[PDB]
Amino acid sequence: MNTVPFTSAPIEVTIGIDQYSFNVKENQPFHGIKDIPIGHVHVIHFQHADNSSMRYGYWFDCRMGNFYIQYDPKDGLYKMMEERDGAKFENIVHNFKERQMMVSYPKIDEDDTWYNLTEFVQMDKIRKIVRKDENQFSYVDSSMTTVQENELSDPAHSLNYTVINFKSREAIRPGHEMEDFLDKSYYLNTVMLQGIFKNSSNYFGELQFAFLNAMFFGNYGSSLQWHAMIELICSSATVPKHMLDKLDEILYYQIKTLPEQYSDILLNERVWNICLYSSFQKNSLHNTEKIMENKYPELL
């Protein structure tokens, strides 16, 4: 169990921690979140009571430092910060637990939701996508764009997801134009998995972070990445049987966790009706197909 204390809550804000969230009222006595499970990455995020525009948040791992939140009134936002003095830190936390000004990470013991959503997500990879290497944590918000999106304007504040493009020379070998494009096994297996990702787990982590960034901040380029990385697999006739089985679980929990009312912006009709009903892997997503059809039949 670890802790993210807050200096204070000067402004009314909705606070997000992983899939949970609670309302904090302006200058209520609040001083942060305790009992945060060690062992997974996490994301604390924020939506100010005034400007529902811009959700923003920080990914982090209590293994990699003592981190706290402090509202900054020049810049207008709750800022994450690392405390180098470990003794100073335990002291403050203990002070706040004794006075009981911390809410508790409220995990049910039967619940593997967060783990399932972050199974392959690792801080080091996130920090290669959100380059800000003076911080051990990584900032993200609604309006950030992707490298691929800046090619179709500030490069330091971008999401450097892996560029996937089905109509590219990377995707498409000379003389196998129709073969490579209609069956993306090459692209998937050799170019991306063997070439760029190394293993299936790194691929899946990027895919899980893309999705969470889309769902927690409605980051639009993240969503496109997510659907892109799904689509490549579904459009490849040759996939390791183990990767297919893990994808099906991965997508199941995503679809399970999605707000019913946010579904219409975050689910791409074409990709899913293609993956589930047209692509090579139409038969291979039993759990994903069952929950999609019982929850969002309108999309299909």
Partner 1 sequence: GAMNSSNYAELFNNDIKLFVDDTNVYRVTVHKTFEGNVATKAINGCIFTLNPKTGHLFLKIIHTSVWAGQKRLSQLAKWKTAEEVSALVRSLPKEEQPKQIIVTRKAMLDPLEVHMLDFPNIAIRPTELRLPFSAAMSIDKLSDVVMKATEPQMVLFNIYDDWLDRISSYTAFSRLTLLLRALKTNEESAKMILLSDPTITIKSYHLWPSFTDEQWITIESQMRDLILTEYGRKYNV
| Shortest distance, position 187 Cβ to partner 1, whole Å | 12
Enumerate residues 124-183 that contact partner 1 by CB under 8 A.
167-169, 172, 177-178, 181
| Shortest distance, position 180 Cβ to partner 1, whole Å | 8
Residue closer to partner 1, measured from CB, 215 or 228: 228
| Shortest distance, position 188 Cβ to partner 1, whole Å | 17
| Shortest distance, position 208 Cβ to partner 1, whole Å | 30
Residues binding partner 1: number (CB under 8 A): 7
Residue closer to partner 1, measured from CB, 108 or 178: 178
Give the chain as a 3 state SS string: CEEEEECCCCCCEEEEECCEEEEECCCCCCCEEEEECCCCCEEEEEEECCCCCCCEEEEECHHHCEEEEEEECCCCEEEEEEECCHHHHHHHHHHHHHHCCCEECCCCCCCCHHHHHHCCCCHHHHHHHCCCCCCCCEEEECCCCEHHHHCCCCCCCCECCCCCCCCCCCCCCCCCHHHHHHCCHHHHHHHHHHHHHCCHHHHHHHHHHHHHHHHHHCCHHHHHHHHHHHHHHHCCCCCCHHHHHHHHHHHHHHHHHCCHHHHHHHCCHHHHHHHHHCCCCCCCCHHHHHHHHHHCHHHC
Residue closer to partner 1, measured from CB, 73 or 174: 174
36 lies in the binding site for partner 1 (CB under 8 A): no
Enumerate residues 190-209 that contact partner 1 by CB under 8 A.
none
Enumerate residues 90-129 that contact partner 1 by CB under 8 A.
none
| Shortest distance, position 268 Cβ to partner 1, whole Å | 18
Residues of the shown chain interacting with partner 1 in the complex, contacts defined by CB under 8 A: 167-169, 172, 177-178, 181
